Write a protein that binds this ligand. Structure first.
Ligand SMILES: *[C@H](NCCCCC(=O)O)c1c(COP(=O)(O)O)cnc(C)c1O
Ligand SMILES: *[C@H](NCCCCC(=O)O)c1c(COP(=O)(O)O)cnc(C)c1O
Lengths: 403, 403
């Protein structure tokens, strides 16, 4: 039986070094808990970047996969499968959009959104071909494709990865005057923005920012693209993080928790006047819309609905942030977030940083990832209960004040 | 009980119109057979673009998925999981490369290969930053991302989709002189090519083109990237189509049959000097390398090995091409292919075409899809047997001569 150090050394020898994970080798997961190969038990306070909002191996999602895998898993889109239309009707009625375009990973949904915005910009808005612009916010993250890192302001994402995709403008985040200035270019076809910036360090914009984006985009006839791949599906306390200001984006991107972690499923939602600019043969994906991922996506959505995970994430997130703000200011310098998507800012020194705090948190039974050496994210599964949350808060307080 | 027509209209109402599939609504699949919602039984001669080489719902792959879904499905790569290193050692030793970078979809493996080539071009070869070029062959297909369509010579894939990715040069397929001409530029970092062009219509290059490409790339210090996402994993009669010419590419792209159609799993294989140009935090993906997909990948590869599907694809492919060449020259003008990846060219008129041939093949219990109005692909799962193949050949004969 391989030990933890045996697992690390194997991946180091046979796997690419594109990651430096926290040294812990998990083998089992259920609900909010993870178990390493030595049997130790941990609070999962990362949730695989909100991909297991429903908890690890939720039985209802597991049973949908097990039932469908015996029947049919992949026909490709050259033919019809019987499950896709069921999932399509369900999700478009749920979020109240005309249609959905199914993909697999989150960056594939973002690529589809950029392609929809350009095609709509040329064939509907009438922009001169191949001058269409898409505006992004600084600190944005929507994948690791060449196009995704082309709009990135993070040097680690784009440094050394070749000439970059043109047609992408970058403005500061949480800045309405900068968006107004950017939207003066009549070649702008879309503004793609996260309601909360996850990988940037759980950056929450000021109240009214989302209404301002919706108003500005409407006034200049520009597509409002909301990337809810991380913020959506009850993680911030609502079905969509844009529900906190009640704005209707033109294009909504879903993913991650869309399958509870059991299958790579993403989705792109918009109305007919945007969706139907793409004709047959002009876009798609091999596994996109396969019957297996559709069954787990139907079940993963039903778990969020019938277990009221959005409400639980809302009231539990207020407890988490309030308890975190009691830590001394000379240790944590900021606590922010919405619902169960939160982060703390560490007064980093030369000797003490967020990585060491996470190593000690692991020692005390709580797993979390640092995002920038002074930021630590706390995002547990939404099925957590108040007592389990308070137990984890005890682990956080003890670890933080033990330095 | 939704009927076949009901399934068509439901997807039309709530789903994007990016496809025009053959009108047949499948709900069950096993081995080489597919069943529609009315209970009719079909031969599958597309294999979901070689994604179910092992047949639909192979019990060994299904059992691997059913066993792992209850333990653990997704930790993200911020932590370690016990399954990934097992798959990494298995797939690297199997194909004889140092390391593997796991991704989900085929286009994501292509994007990863491009990022590896560029990072290798700047950090190892010494190209000034963002002058690196990647050469592609006309008629190529490797996904629908912005980067992917930026190298396509098919207008239906790049038309109306905005500014394109710089640094992508295109040369004619099956053209060694054009390749050396393109490689005279020292800023070229890689050449990505399919050993047999699938979506182009099963375009098999001349003998020696592969070892010539291998020789030209090595001479000019250029990375040879072989896209075996469709040609690899026994579909053409070998583990990799390049094995027919003993060619070892610098980077191999695998995908799609890598999971037997049960999960989106793709792989990027290369040695240390190429792979380790990407440092921790510089590339990744949420679902890339999750334990659930690694288990079904190990089982999918094991099925291909211990069932000798490459030898089976080699033998039966010879029979299939032999029988197909017995068709008259005024109806079928060309028959090409390696192993069980084959295609026929239809003497298309205004009267009849390949779509009507595939419609009537569907009527006679065999599913296949045309690729260009005059090309029809015949690619059944590699678990097919000779008598089952000959029954299908009879169906292919009687439909063609029925026009
Ligand atoms: C998901 N990214 C969250 C952090 C994961 C980093 C990593 O690469 O390991 C995310 C995406 C991309 O989704 P995929 O990783 O391609 O499935 C896009 N947009 C948002 C808001 C995300 O959180
Ligand atoms: C897979 N062939 C794509 C099948 C076309 C149907 C569709 O819906 O697009 C393939 C890829 C792309 O892999 P992914 O679709 O991204 O998983 C890349 N390269 C080759 C040679 C393929 O066969």
């Amino acid at each position: 039986p391989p030990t933890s150090d045996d697992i690390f050394e194997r991946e180091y020898k046979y796997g690419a070094h594109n990651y430096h994970p926290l040294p812990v080798a998990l083998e089992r997961g259920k609900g909010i808990y993870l178990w390493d190969v030595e049997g130790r038990k941990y609070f999962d306070f990362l949730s695989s970047y909100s991909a297991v909002n429903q908890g690890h191996c939720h039985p209802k999602i597991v049973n949908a996969l097990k039932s469908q895998v015996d029947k049919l898993t992949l026909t490709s889109r050259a033919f019809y499968n019987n499950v896709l239309g069921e999932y399509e009707e369900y999700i478009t009625k749920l979020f109240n959009y005309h249609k959905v375009l199914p993909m697999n990973t989150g960056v594939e949904a973002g690529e589809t959104a950029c392609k929809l915005a350009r095609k709509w910009g040329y064939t509907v808005k009438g922009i001169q071909k191949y001058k269409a612009k898409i505006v992004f916010a600084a600190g944005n993250f929507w994948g690791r494709t060449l196009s995704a890192i082309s709009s990135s302001t993070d040097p680690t994402s784009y440094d050394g990865f070749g000439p970059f995709m043109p047609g992408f403008d970058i403005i500061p985040y949480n800045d309405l005057p900068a968006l107004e200035r950017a939207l003066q270019d009549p070649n702008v076809a879309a503004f793609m923005v996260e309601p909360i910036q996850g990988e940037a360090g759980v950056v929450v914009p000021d109240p009214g920012y989302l209404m301002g984006v919706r108003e500005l985009c409407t006034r200049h006839q520009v597509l409002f693209i909301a990337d809810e791949i991380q913020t959506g599906l009850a993680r911030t306390g609502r079905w969509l993080a844009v529900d906190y200001e009640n704005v209707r984006p033109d294009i909504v991107l879903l993913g991650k928790a869309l399958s509870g972690g059991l299958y790579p499923v993403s989705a792109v939602l918009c109305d007919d006047d945007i969706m139907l600019t793409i004709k047959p043969g002009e876009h798609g994906s091999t596994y996109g819309g396969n019957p297996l991922g559709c069954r787990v996506a139907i079940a993963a959505l039903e778990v969020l609905e019938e277990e009221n995970l959005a409400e639980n994430a809302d009231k539990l997130g207020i407890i988490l942030r309030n308890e975190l703000m009691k830590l001394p200011s000379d240790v944590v310098t900021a606590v922010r977030g919405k619902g169960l998507l939160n982060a703390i800012v560490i007064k980093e020194t030369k000797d003490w940083d967020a990585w060491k705090v996470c190593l000690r948190l692991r020692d005390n039974g709580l797993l979390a990832k640092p995002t920038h050496g002074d930021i630590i994210r706390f995002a547990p599964p939404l099925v957590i209960k108040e007592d389990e949350l308070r137990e984890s808060i005890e682990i956080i307080n003890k670890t933080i004040l033990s330095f």
